[PDB]
mmCIF file of C-alpha atoms in Angstrom:
data_model
loop_
_atom_site.group_PDB
_atom_site.id
_atom_site.type_symbol
_atom_site.label_atom_id
_atom_site.label_comp_id
_atom_site.label_asym_id
_atom_site.label_seq_id
_atom_site.Cartn_x
_atom_site.Cartn_y
_atom_site.Cartn_z
ATOM 1 C CA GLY A 1 27.516 24.076 21.439
ATOM 2 C CA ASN A 2 27.244 20.654 23.061
ATOM 3 C CA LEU A 3 24.071 18.792 22.172
ATOM 4 C CA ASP A 4 22.023 16.375 24.261
ATOM 5 C CA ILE A 5 19.954 13.935 22.215
ATOM 6 C CA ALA A 6 17.387 11.529 23.654
ATOM 7 C CA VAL A 7 16.254 8.526 21.635
ATOM 8 C CA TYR A 8 13.524 5.915 21.873
ATOM 9 C CA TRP A 9 14.734 2.336 21.793
ATOM 10 C CA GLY A 10 12.791 -0.911 21.624
ATOM 11 C CA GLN A 11 10.616 -0.336 18.562
ATOM 12 C CA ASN A 12 11.916 -3.223 16.437
ATOM 13 C CA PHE A 13 13.140 -6.811 16.964
ATOM 14 C CA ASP A 14 15.803 -6.200 14.305
ATOM 15 C CA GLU A 15 17.245 -2.919 15.610
ATOM 16 C CA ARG A 16 20.827 -2.155 16.634
ATOM 17 C CA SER A 17 21.070 -3.545 20.196
ATOM 18 C CA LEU A 18 20.817 -1.352 23.287
ATOM 19 C CA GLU A 19 24.528 -1.487 24.163
ATOM 20 C CA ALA A 20 25.587 -0.720 20.601
ATOM 21 C CA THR A 21 23.099 2.131 20.650
ATOM 22 C CA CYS A 22 24.820 3.485 23.776
ATOM 23 C CA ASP A 23 28.264 2.791 22.328
ATOM 24 C CA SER A 24 27.462 5.114 19.400
ATOM 25 C CA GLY A 25 28.172 8.057 21.713
ATOM 26 C CA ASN A 26 25.388 10.161 20.184
ATOM 27 C CA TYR A 27 22.935 10.071 23.061
ATOM 28 C CA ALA A 28 22.577 11.369 26.604
ATOM 29 C CA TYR A 29 19.279 9.500 27.189
ATOM 30 C CA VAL A 30 18.008 6.180 25.894
ATOM 31 C CA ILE A 31 14.298 5.584 26.473
ATOM 32 C CA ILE A 32 13.135 1.979 26.464
ATOM 33 C CA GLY A 33 9.638 1.644 25.109
ATOM 34 C CA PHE A 34 7.016 0.591 26.139
ATOM 35 C CA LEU A 35 5.215 -0.717 29.151
ATOM 36 C CA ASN A 36 2.006 -0.615 27.186
ATOM 37 C CA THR A 37 -0.385 -2.771 29.201
ATOM 38 C CA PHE A 38 -1.776 -1.760 32.585
ATOM 39 C CA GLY A 39 -4.910 -0.731 34.377
ATOM 40 C CA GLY A 40 -8.455 -1.946 33.911
ATOM 41 C CA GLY A 41 -8.004 -5.292 35.651
ATOM 42 C CA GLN A 42 -4.872 -5.922 33.603
ATOM 43 C CA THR A 43 -1.500 -7.084 34.841
ATOM 44 C CA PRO A 44 1.338 -4.827 33.575
ATOM 45 C CA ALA A 45 3.213 -5.953 30.478
ATOM 46 C CA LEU A 46 5.988 -4.842 28.175
ATOM 47 C CA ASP A 47 5.900 -4.620 24.453
ATOM 48 C CA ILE A 48 9.513 -4.097 23.549
ATOM 49 C CA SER A 49 9.157 -5.632 20.094
ATOM 50 C CA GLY A 50 10.218 -9.114 21.178
ATOM 51 C CA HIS A 51 13.569 -8.277 22.786
ATOM 52 C CA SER A 52 14.201 -10.462 25.826
ATOM 53 C CA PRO A 53 13.555 -8.383 28.998
ATOM 54 C CA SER A 54 16.182 -10.253 31.021
ATOM 55 C CA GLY A 55 18.695 -10.011 28.196
ATOM 56 C CA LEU A 56 18.646 -6.241 28.670
ATOM 57 C CA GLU A 57 20.128 -6.415 32.164
ATOM 58 C CA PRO A 58 23.808 -6.347 31.197
ATOM 59 C CA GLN A 59 23.115 -3.863 28.398
ATOM 60 C CA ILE A 60 21.473 -1.309 30.670
ATOM 61 C CA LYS A 61 24.452 -1.485 33.044
ATOM 62 C CA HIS A 62 26.884 -1.069 30.145
ATOM 63 C CA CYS A 63 24.916 1.959 28.964
ATOM 64 C CA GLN A 64 25.006 3.501 32.441
ATOM 65 C CA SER A 65 28.723 2.876 32.918
ATOM 66 C CA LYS A 66 29.229 4.899 29.735
ATOM 67 C CA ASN A 67 27.101 7.597 31.374
ATOM 68 C CA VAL A 68 24.013 7.216 29.207
ATOM 69 C CA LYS A 69 20.766 7.575 31.186
ATOM 70 C CA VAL A 70 18.300 4.702 30.624
ATOM 71 C CA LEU A 71 14.560 5.310 31.116
ATOM 72 C CA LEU A 72 11.453 3.098 30.859
ATOM 73 C CA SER A 73 8.504 4.619 29.033
ATOM 74 C CA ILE A 74 4.980 3.776 30.088
ATOM 75 C CA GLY A 75 2.020 3.923 27.726
ATOM 76 C CA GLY A 76 3.020 4.364 24.100
ATOM 77 C CA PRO A 77 1.442 5.101 20.719
ATOM 78 C CA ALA A 78 -0.780 2.029 20.950
ATOM 79 C CA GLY A 79 -1.954 -0.270 23.696
ATOM 80 C CA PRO A 80 -4.609 -1.404 26.151
ATOM 81 C CA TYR A 81 -3.401 0.922 28.899
ATOM 82 C CA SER A 82 -5.546 3.038 31.192
ATOM 83 C CA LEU A 83 -5.273 4.484 34.699
ATOM 84 C CA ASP A 84 -8.897 5.270 35.446
ATOM 85 C CA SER A 85 -9.099 4.553 39.181
ATOM 86 C CA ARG A 86 -7.094 5.710 42.197
ATOM 87 C CA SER A 87 -6.032 2.148 43.027
ATOM 88 C CA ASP A 88 -4.679 1.690 39.486
ATOM 89 C CA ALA A 89 -2.371 4.676 39.986
ATOM 90 C CA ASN A 90 -1.125 3.373 43.345
ATOM 91 C CA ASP A 91 -0.658 -0.167 42.027
ATOM 92 C CA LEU A 92 1.380 0.958 39.038
ATOM 93 C CA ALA A 93 3.368 3.422 41.141
ATOM 94 C CA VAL A 94 4.556 0.813 43.627
ATOM 95 C CA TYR A 95 5.103 -1.802 40.899
ATOM 96 C CA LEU A 96 7.357 0.576 38.933
ATOM 97 C CA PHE A 97 9.164 1.460 42.158
ATOM 98 C CA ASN A 98 9.921 -2.069 43.406
ATOM 99 C CA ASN A 99 10.702 -3.566 40.031
ATOM 100 C CA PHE A 100 12.593 -0.843 38.178
ATOM 101 C CA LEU A 101 13.690 2.056 40.351
ATOM 102 C CA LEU A 102 15.076 0.156 43.335
ATOM 103 C CA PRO A 103 17.776 -2.497 43.896
ATOM 104 C CA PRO A 104 16.210 -5.985 44.127
ATOM 105 C CA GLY A 105 14.032 -7.685 46.720
ATOM 106 C CA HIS A 106 13.367 -11.387 46.344
ATOM 107 C CA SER A 107 9.621 -12.257 46.631
ATOM 108 C CA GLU A 108 9.077 -11.422 42.969
ATOM 109 C CA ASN A 109 11.553 -10.694 40.200
ATOM 110 C CA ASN A 110 12.464 -7.598 38.232
ATOM 111 C CA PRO A 111 11.588 -7.838 34.500
ATOM 112 C CA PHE A 112 15.034 -6.424 33.674
ATOM 113 C CA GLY A 113 16.777 -8.377 36.419
ATOM 114 C CA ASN A 114 19.071 -6.510 38.799
ATOM 115 C CA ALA A 115 19.338 -3.387 36.703
ATOM 116 C CA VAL A 116 17.908 -0.215 38.194
ATOM 117 C CA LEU A 117 16.790 2.416 35.724
ATOM 118 C CA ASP A 118 17.314 6.152 35.778
ATOM 119 C CA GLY A 119 13.670 7.165 35.403
ATOM 120 C CA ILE A 120 10.153 6.843 34.030
ATOM 121 C CA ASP A 121 8.873 8.452 30.816
ATOM 122 C CA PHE A 122 5.159 9.314 30.539
ATOM 123 C CA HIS A 123 4.250 8.702 26.866
ATOM 124 C CA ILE A 124 0.479 8.838 27.400
ATOM 125 C CA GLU A 125 -1.428 9.328 24.148
ATOM 126 C CA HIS A 126 -4.971 8.377 25.087
ATOM 127 C CA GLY A 127 -7.152 8.188 28.179
ATOM 128 C CA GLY A 128 -7.286 11.831 29.224
ATOM 129 C CA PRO A 129 -5.490 13.031 32.412
ATOM 130 C CA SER A 130 -7.297 10.335 34.420
ATOM 131 C CA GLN A 131 -5.232 9.570 37.503
ATOM 132 C CA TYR A 132 -1.873 10.300 35.891
ATOM 133 C CA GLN A 133 -1.560 13.253 38.296
ATOM 134 C CA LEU A 134 -1.938 10.835 41.224
ATOM 135 C CA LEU A 135 0.555 8.387 39.689
ATOM 136 C CA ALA A 136 3.089 11.206 39.291
ATOM 137 C CA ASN A 137 2.518 12.430 42.872
ATOM 138 C CA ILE A 138 3.412 9.048 44.315
ATOM 139 C CA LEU A 139 6.440 8.527 42.075
ATOM 140 C CA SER A 140 7.512 12.053 43.002
ATOM 141 C CA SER A 141 7.034 11.110 46.657
ATOM 142 C CA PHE A 142 9.479 8.183 46.316
ATOM 143 C CA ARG A 143 11.947 10.525 44.594
ATOM 144 C CA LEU A 144 11.861 12.543 47.839
ATOM 145 C CA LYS A 145 12.585 9.365 49.816
ATOM 146 C CA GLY A 146 16.197 9.145 48.724
ATOM 147 C CA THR A 147 15.861 7.198 45.506
ATOM 148 C CA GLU A 148 16.552 9.921 42.937
ATOM 149 C CA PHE A 149 15.447 9.151 39.396
ATOM 150 C CA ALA A 150 13.919 11.373 36.709
ATOM 151 C CA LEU A 151 10.344 11.794 35.551
ATOM 152 C CA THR A 152 9.861 12.898 31.950
ATOM 153 C CA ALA A 153 6.961 13.262 29.534
ATOM 154 C CA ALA A 154 6.422 13.107 25.773
ATOM 155 C CA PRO A 155 3.317 15.234 24.951
ATOM 156 C CA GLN A 156 2.063 15.972 21.459
ATOM 157 C CA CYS A 157 2.870 19.393 20.056
ATOM 158 C CA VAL A 158 -0.463 21.132 20.676
ATOM 159 C CA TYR A 159 -0.463 23.100 23.929
ATOM 160 C CA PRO A 160 -1.894 22.258 26.349
ATOM 161 C CA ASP A 161 -1.625 18.520 25.862
ATOM 162 C CA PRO A 162 -5.056 16.863 26.186
ATOM 163 C CA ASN A 163 -3.631 13.873 28.060
ATOM 164 C CA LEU A 164 -0.769 15.386 30.077
ATOM 165 C CA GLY A 165 -1.171 19.173 30.236
ATOM 166 C CA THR A 166 -2.872 18.996 33.611
ATOM 167 C CA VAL A 167 -0.035 16.929 35.049
ATOM 168 C CA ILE A 168 2.698 18.954 33.348
ATOM 169 C CA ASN A 169 1.270 22.090 35.019
ATOM 170 C CA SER A 170 2.186 20.482 38.371
ATOM 171 C CA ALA A 171 5.848 21.017 37.411
ATOM 172 C CA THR A 172 6.777 17.466 38.438
ATOM 173 C CA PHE A 173 8.680 16.621 35.227
ATOM 174 C CA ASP A 174 12.416 17.175 35.016
ATOM 175 C CA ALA A 175 12.333 17.121 31.229
ATOM 176 C CA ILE A 176 9.773 17.238 28.445
ATOM 177 C CA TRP A 177 10.326 16.150 24.834
ATOM 178 C CA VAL A 178 7.505 17.534 22.740
ATOM 179 C CA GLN A 179 6.557 15.460 19.714
ATOM 180 C CA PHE A 180 6.880 17.858 16.798
ATOM 181 C CA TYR A 181 5.463 15.350 14.297
ATOM 182 C CA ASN A 182 2.305 13.513 13.158
ATOM 183 C CA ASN A 183 0.302 16.753 13.579
ATOM 184 C CA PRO A 184 0.399 19.491 10.911
ATOM 185 C CA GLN A 185 -0.980 22.127 13.311
ATOM 186 C CA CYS A 186 2.354 22.243 15.117
ATOM 187 C CA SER A 187 5.133 20.559 13.113
ATOM 188 C CA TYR A 188 7.193 21.182 9.937
ATOM 189 C CA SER A 189 4.883 20.835 6.892
ATOM 190 C CA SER A 190 5.880 22.017 3.417
ATOM 191 C CA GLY A 191 9.057 24.008 3.558
ATOM 192 C CA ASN A 192 7.024 25.727 6.275
ATOM 193 C CA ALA A 193 8.252 26.095 9.849
ATOM 194 C CA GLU A 194 5.805 28.828 10.944
ATOM 195 C CA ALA A 195 3.542 26.277 12.679
ATOM 196 C CA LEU A 196 6.511 24.595 14.372
ATOM 197 C CA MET A 197 8.263 27.785 15.540
ATOM 198 C CA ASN A 198 4.965 28.957 17.011
ATOM 199 C CA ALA A 199 4.394 25.698 18.861
ATOM 200 C CA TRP A 200 7.940 25.865 20.183
ATOM 201 C CA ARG A 201 7.577 29.435 21.495
ATOM 202 C CA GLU A 202 4.500 28.377 23.404
ATOM 203 C CA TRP A 203 6.022 25.270 24.971
ATOM 204 C CA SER A 204 9.273 26.963 26.005
ATOM 205 C CA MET A 205 7.408 29.875 27.566
ATOM 206 C CA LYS A 206 4.542 28.069 29.262
ATOM 207 C CA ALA A 207 5.775 24.536 30.079
ATOM 208 C CA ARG A 208 6.554 24.123 33.778
ATOM 209 C CA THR A 209 9.749 22.096 33.587
ATOM 210 C CA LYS A 210 13.436 22.862 33.633
ATOM 211 C CA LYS A 211 14.170 21.289 30.225
ATOM 212 C CA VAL A 212 12.160 21.198 26.993
ATOM 213 C CA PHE A 213 13.513 19.053 24.135
ATOM 214 C CA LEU A 214 12.362 19.208 20.510
ATOM 215 C CA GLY A 215 11.168 15.827 19.239
ATOM 216 C CA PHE A 216 11.702 14.910 15.582
ATOM 217 C CA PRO A 217 11.378 11.727 13.546
ATOM 218 C CA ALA A 218 14.762 10.470 12.270
ATOM 219 C CA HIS A 219 13.511 9.420 8.855
ATOM 220 C CA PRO A 220 10.626 10.247 6.480
ATOM 221 C CA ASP A 221 9.249 6.727 7.076
ATOM 222 C CA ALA A 222 9.455 6.986 10.885
ATOM 223 C CA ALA A 223 6.343 9.163 11.142
ATOM 224 C CA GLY A 224 3.269 10.250 9.211
ATOM 225 C CA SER A 225 4.318 13.877 8.987
ATOM 226 C CA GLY A 226 6.807 16.363 10.403
ATOM 227 C CA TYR A 227 10.148 15.132 9.073
ATOM 228 C CA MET A 228 12.696 17.974 8.767
ATOM 229 C CA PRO A 229 16.189 17.387 7.285
ATOM 230 C CA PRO A 230 19.180 17.773 9.664
ATOM 231 C CA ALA A 231 20.617 20.730 7.761
ATOM 232 C CA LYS A 232 17.365 22.544 8.175
ATOM 233 C CA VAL A 233 17.095 21.828 11.894
ATOM 234 C CA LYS A 234 20.529 23.357 12.586
ATOM 235 C CA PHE A 235 19.903 26.424 10.400
ATOM 236 C CA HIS A 236 16.197 27.081 11.167
ATOM 237 C CA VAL A 237 15.702 25.905 14.698
ATOM 238 C CA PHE A 238 18.885 25.995 16.750
ATOM 239 C CA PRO A 239 19.492 29.766 16.506
ATOM 240 C CA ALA A 240 16.081 30.598 18.003
ATOM 241 C CA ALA A 241 15.975 27.699 20.469
ATOM 242 C CA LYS A 242 19.352 28.172 22.172
ATOM 243 C CA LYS A 243 18.102 31.631 23.015
ATOM 244 C CA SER A 244 15.853 29.875 25.512
ATOM 245 C CA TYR A 245 16.829 29.106 29.091
ATOM 246 C CA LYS A 246 14.726 25.966 28.834
ATOM 247 C CA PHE A 247 16.351 24.527 25.683
ATOM 248 C CA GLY A 248 17.324 20.922 26.362
ATOM 249 C CA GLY A 249 18.444 19.496 23.039
ATOM 250 C CA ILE A 250 16.492 17.192 20.762
ATOM 251 C CA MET A 251 14.603 13.903 21.036
ATOM 252 C CA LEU A 252 14.698 11.436 18.160
ATOM 253 C CA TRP A 253 11.992 9.036 17.059
ATOM 254 C CA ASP A 254 13.573 6.498 16.949
ATOM 255 C CA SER A 255 16.760 4.372 17.213
ATOM 256 C CA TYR A 256 15.862 1.897 14.554
ATOM 257 C CA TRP A 257 15.440 4.764 12.050
ATOM 258 C CA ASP A 258 18.436 6.864 13.186
ATOM 259 C CA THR A 259 20.675 3.851 12.522
ATOM 260 C CA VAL A 260 19.391 3.995 8.930
ATOM 261 C CA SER A 261 19.312 7.768 8.324
ATOM 262 C CA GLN A 262 22.286 8.763 10.520
ATOM 263 C CA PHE A 263 20.337 11.868 11.506
ATOM 264 C CA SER A 264 22.056 12.350 14.892
ATOM 265 C CA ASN A 265 25.470 11.949 13.279
ATOM 266 C CA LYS A 266 24.621 14.727 10.810
ATOM 267 C CA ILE A 267 23.228 16.938 13.590
ATOM 268 C CA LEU A 268 26.385 16.547 15.720
ATOM 269 C CA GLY A 269 29.151 16.749 13.094
ATOM 270 C CA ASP A 270 29.077 12.945 12.850
ATOM 271 C CA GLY A 271 30.815 11.117 15.677
ATOM 272 C CA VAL A 272 31.796 9.988 19.167
#
């Protein structure tokens, strides 16, 4: 039926802008990546491939007025991030709250200006569970203080996830987009979906969240392994996945590549 697609944005200086990405009409969620520097005596920092942070202010608002949810992803595939101590978790929690999830205050200054985002995406790929449980408890606390936003996670496809499984079991995430790529044990391999279908059954049965999305790379070049053509996703996957109460739609890695491949257009019947 209707399909919700989430896509990562911010992976290339030369990519279709954020507002044009929202104007495509293909996505329900746009995830800005990544706040990839924090913890360990480090001041937080963004690596959004050189796009001007402030320049994104009007674009985020345009996206939202067209009803596209805009999230900020912390961590990322690569980066000097870690949340080893309890004070790191608290520091990052209140920094994300003041500067991204709330309207402005004036003894500082929001990296994205006066825009307020719709949520935080945990894209933790190294460091173990550390204090990510604590970080999520505080963010979740604020969510219960009248400032509703969403908390999501992007775990690898092996269950349980070594870095986030512990935290996911707390059921704090509103949505999960499992990365069904870069790992042959649980993604599409050689005209072979057995590994993928098995991973999917596990995640949709055991994951403690309301929505589980299937994450795929939008182009053969976008990831080391796991690419599955659109026609095969609709034929192979969708019949068995819709049969799940937790089916959310799909997540695409990433915007820069979808612009090239037109994967989401093919998946949807190409359009707006």
